[PDB]
């Protein structure tokens, strides 16, 4: 979304109340995260707590491993509720953006003020706390959805093009899953058909081998600030933490069937944090429930059985596929009755163009026959 004066006024008016609300949310989220971190350190697996090293097979660069460095706390409901987890995730996003802004301010002293003016003129990178009314929150959500639309297609195309150019599926079912994975949101994708793509891509690329450019595109699509990007293991850590929290909340909801009892707005927010339900689509409860059930089905029974989610890259592609709107087409079909090269009519045809028209026109067969006969006669005379 582009900046505007109205949004600038809105953010300037709500700047200090927004900061105060952000501080209160910071205290609350610090408490929640302290609880979660204590539980992880106490009951977490040895590899997860010790931060086991997983190196790539080509350049031996360490990155988070989905199996080892990600752990689902099935018993987190005792200490932390679902709403607390959602609050923590939202605060994590807001805190990331605020931390980047504060780092810029500290680095550049008082020279960041005009850049701050640019920042407050757009809702893309402002915290949710700056919105004090429903309309402001709706506009902020619209800006976030616009950024997601802007970013996701690049990530999807990167993944699909790299895989298709450097590899092909093994069997027909994998082919169908791969083809249906990257369909536009206007059609409904069956998670059962699409799931094998996860194993296929695990064969191709895991979350531990994700490239830095693809990571940048993903972070753009997740409304995660990317500047300064730095090494790939920082925003990678952010992504891992966010999706670990999301998986814990998803396990809690699936086990306790909270989504059925979840209200309409809370359900919409829950889907939105999973990048499943844009607000501009004006989805009803039926569609939200369908998408959430499809997401749970894609996670698969193994998620509940052992807390193991499918490949994170494929999961991100699948969820972001809802932001891959059909390519725009505006204009009545009658426009196809016009002509594009009328301005050349005055130039006419030169000798070469006339020759080409004569040779390849409706008389082409006659000219070909005459030419071939003449050439044959000349060749016979030569011999």
């Amino acid at each position: 979304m582009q900046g505007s004066w109205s949004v600038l006024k809105k953010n300037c008016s709500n700047f200090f109340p927004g900061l105060l609300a952000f501080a209160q949310q910071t205290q609350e989220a610090y408490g929640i995260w302290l609880r979660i971190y204590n539980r992880q350190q106490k009951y977490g697996p040895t590899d997860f707590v010790e931060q086991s090293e997983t190196f790539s097979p080509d350049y031996h660069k360490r990155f988070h491993s989905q199996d080892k460095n990600m752990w689902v706390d099935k018993e987190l409901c005792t200490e932390v509720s679902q709403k607390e987890v959602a609050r923590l995730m939202t605060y994590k996003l807001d805190m990331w953006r605020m931390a980047h802004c504060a780092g810029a301010l500290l680095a550049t002293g008082g020279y960041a003020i005009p850049f701050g003016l640019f920042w407050l003129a757009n809702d893309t990178w402002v915290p949710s706390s700056f919105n004090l009314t429903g309309e402001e929150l709706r506009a902020w959500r619209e800006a976030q959805d616009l950024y997601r639309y802007r970013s996701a297609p690049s990530y999807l195309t990167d993944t699909k093009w790299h895989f298709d150019f450097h590899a092909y599926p093994w069997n027909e079912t994998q082919e169908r899953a791969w083809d249906d994975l990257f369909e536009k949101n206007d059609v409904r994708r069956d998670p059962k058909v699409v799931r094998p793509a996860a194993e296929m891509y695990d064969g191709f690329i895991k979350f531990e081998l994700i490239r830095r450019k693809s990571l940048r595109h993903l972070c753009r699509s997740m409304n995660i600030p990317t500047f300064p990007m730095l090494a790939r293991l920082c925003n990678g850590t952010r992504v891992r933490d966010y999706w670990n929290l999301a998986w814990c909340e998803d396990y809690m909801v699936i086990t306790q069937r909270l989504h059925e009892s979840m209200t309409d707005e809370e359900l919409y927010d829950y889907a939105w944090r999973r990048y499943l339900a844009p607000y501009d689509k004006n989805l009803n409860r039926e569609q939200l429930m369908e998408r959430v059930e499809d997401y749970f089905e894609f996670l698969g029974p193994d998620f509940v059985a052992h807390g193991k989610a499918p490949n994170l890259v494929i999961l991100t592609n699948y969820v972001l596929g809802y932001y891959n709107d059909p390519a725009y087409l505006e204009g009545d079909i009658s426009e196809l009755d016009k002509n594009d090269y009328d301005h050349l009519a005055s130039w006419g045809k030169d000798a070469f163009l006339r020759r080409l028209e004569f040779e390849n026109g409706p008389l082409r067969d006659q000219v070909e026959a005459h030419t071939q006969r003449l050439l044959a006669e000349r060749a016979a005379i030569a011999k």
Partner: protein, 103 residues
């Protein structure tokens, strides 16, 4: 759909290209530019006479001397420099007057 080359304006695309596509090359280019302007940005008068002119240095008018004369006149006039000061001449003003009367 959004694409950097088609949607962004030229300056924005330039910054993106040289910051997230070819940043190391830009850094090396800046390093080399700094080196060139720090060590290869001087030309002595003799070097200019030898190679600095297309057909050769026109000694019959010595434009370098005129250029330096204009430079020094401008500096003296603007900065209000007393070229008769003993440090410039190595002798007192009275000695300078004595020399002028002598020669």
């Amino acid at each position: 759909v959004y694409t950097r080359w088609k949607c962004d304006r030229l300056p924005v695309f330039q910054l993106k290209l040289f910051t997230q596509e070819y940043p190391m090359h830009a850094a090396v280019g800046i390093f080399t530019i700094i080196f060139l302007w720090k060590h290869m940005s001087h030309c002595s008068e003799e070097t200019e006479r030898k190679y600095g002119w297309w057909a050769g240095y026109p000694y019959w008018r010595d434009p370098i001397a005129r250029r330096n004369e204009t430079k020094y006149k401008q500096m003296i006039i603007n900065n209000d420099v007393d070229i008769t000061h003993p440090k410039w001449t190595g002798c007192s003003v009275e000695q300078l007057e004595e020399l002028s009367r002598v020669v």
